[PDB]
Design an enzyme around this catalytic site. Structure first.
Site, PDB file in Angstrom:
ATOM      1  N   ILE A 104      51.410  51.342  87.564  1.00 19.44           N
ATOM      2  CA  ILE A 104      50.852  50.173  86.519  1.00 19.44           C
ATOM      3  C   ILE A 104      51.172  48.929  87.412  1.00 19.44           C
ATOM      4  O   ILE A 104      52.137  48.748  88.068  1.00 19.44           O
ATOM      5  CB  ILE A 104      51.779  50.610  85.277  1.00 19.44           C
ATOM      6  CG1 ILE A 104      51.526  49.508  84.181  1.00 19.44           C
ATOM      7  CG2 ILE A 104      53.264  50.676  85.561  1.00 19.44           C
ATOM      8  CD1 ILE A 104      51.854  49.968  82.665  1.00 19.44           C
ATOM      9  N   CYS A 105      50.559  48.052  86.852  1.00 22.42           N
ATOM     10  CA  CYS A 105      50.871  46.558  87.030  1.00 22.42           C
ATOM     11  C   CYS A 105      50.746  45.976  88.694  1.00 22.42           C
ATOM     12  O   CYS A 105      49.611  46.024  88.953  1.00 22.42           O
ATOM     13  CB  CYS A 105      52.339  46.097  86.545  1.00 22.42           C
ATOM     14  SG  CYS A 105      52.928  44.876  86.469  1.00 22.42           S
ATOM     15  N   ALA A 106      51.898  45.788  89.300  1.00 21.29           N
ATOM     16  CA  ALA A 106      51.709  45.509  90.733  1.00 21.29           C
ATOM     17  C   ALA A 106      51.653  46.546  91.611  1.00 21.29           C
ATOM     18  O   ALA A 106      51.414  46.431  92.695  1.00 21.29           O
ATOM     19  CB  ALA A 106      53.158  44.590  90.962  1.00 21.29           C
ATOM     20  N   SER A 154      47.119  51.386  85.418  1.00 20.50           N
ATOM     21  CA  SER A 154      47.149  50.597  84.063  1.00 20.50           C
ATOM     22  C   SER A 154      47.612  49.228  84.397  1.00 20.50           C
ATOM     23  O   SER A 154      47.917  48.841  85.819  1.00 20.50           O
ATOM     24  CB  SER A 154      47.889  51.123  83.209  1.00 20.50           C
ATOM     25  OG  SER A 154      47.948  50.774  81.751  1.00 20.50           O
TER      26      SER A 154
END
Ligand SMILES: [Mg+2]
Ligand SMILES: [Mg+2]
Lengths: 195, 195
Positions: A104-106, A154
């Site tokens: 997710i994310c970074a 995500s």
């Protein structure tokens, strides 16, 4: 019987990590949290200062019987993951052995892309980092599930519920995902697994 | 300059607590976490097994000049709050000194109602606990801000973003709440404080 290995590092994004762990437990999934701190420390300070205890150092549990490996974001946490030989080898081993990688994310842009773990496949991540995901791979979706490579990605803190629910779908199925979703008082814009 | 005291007890709901802390920090609010009902022990095992380290025992920080006291839910954690004389008195003192009380999930019905802290306040909480809130006080809404008594309430793990954003709006303003919201990749349905 399903199980998940949730990795944690100094600077991991605490909402992403904790929301995911909570949902997985609600889904009946056994969760182990693994520290990727370079020294093996388990008392992790997350990106906004939340202090979270990991269950085990990665070296002790990486060879375990988990269905999914989860990489929270948080820029400095994701950099720690990227720079950990053991973490990268573990991710590669989950993928090569037919198991799921969830990031997710970074984490997609920071960990997966530089190491070329998924040279083919769709992925998302934090939107300000979209130019770090190859253009032919990027999608701007809250969750991206590419079953061809068993890669779940995500976008951010606010998609952590969507992310956790999709892990529940992938490990335990739609009925359990819907059951967990129904507990949360979640916002209308998150898919709730019933039709 | 704004600050928040976030209380934690054995069995607190970790997504509610952590999401709130993270958002407040993103809003530039100083956050102290306090253990409650643990005889000073700072290690708190939350409702789904996430282990957090609190900054301090409540008794040591309860008379700080925080702008808001935050009560996460989780049924066991909220019972610990209800049964802690120090917690209850601290909540009363925040209110009497013109500060905000913020409570989510089981906390309104379990803590605020039995102690009659806000006897004609309007409030929400977790929906399955609607029957524990006097009927004339209940609203079924993701977040309720009763400006007359400075009582902020919210419903569940899935409303923790909405909850945290309203605290930011109240303490540091709408523009900061929007800035934080814009960081998150929030679901459709959640208010983002834009213009
Ligand atoms: Mg390529
Ligand atoms: Mg009454």
């Amino acid at each position: 019987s399903a199980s998940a290995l949730v990795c944690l590092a100094p600077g991991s994004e605490e909402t992403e990590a904790v929301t995911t762990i909570d949902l997985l437990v609600r889904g009946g999934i056994k969760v182990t949290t693994a520290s990727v701190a370079s020294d093996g420390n388990l008392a992790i300070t997350c990106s906004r200062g939340v202090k979270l205890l990991a269950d085990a150092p990665l070296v002790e549990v990486a060879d375990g019987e988990y269905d999914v490996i989860v990489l929270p974001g948080g820029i400095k946490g994701a950099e720690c993951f990227r720079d950990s030989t053991l973490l990268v080898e573990t991710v590669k081993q989950f993928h090569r052995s037919g198991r799921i990688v969830a990031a997710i994310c970074a984490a997609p842009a920071t960990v997966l892309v530089p190491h070329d773990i998924f040279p083919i496949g769709n992925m998302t991540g934090f939107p300000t980092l979209k130019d770090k995901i190859p253009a032919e791979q990027w999608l701007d979706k809250r969750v991206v599930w590419d079953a061809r490579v068993k890669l779940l990605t995500s976008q951010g803190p606010g998609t952590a519920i969507d992310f956790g629910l999709k892990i529940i779908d992938l490990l335990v199925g739609r009925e359990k995902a819907h059951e967990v979703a129904s507990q949360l008082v979640m916002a209308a814009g998150i898919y709730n697994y019933y039709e």
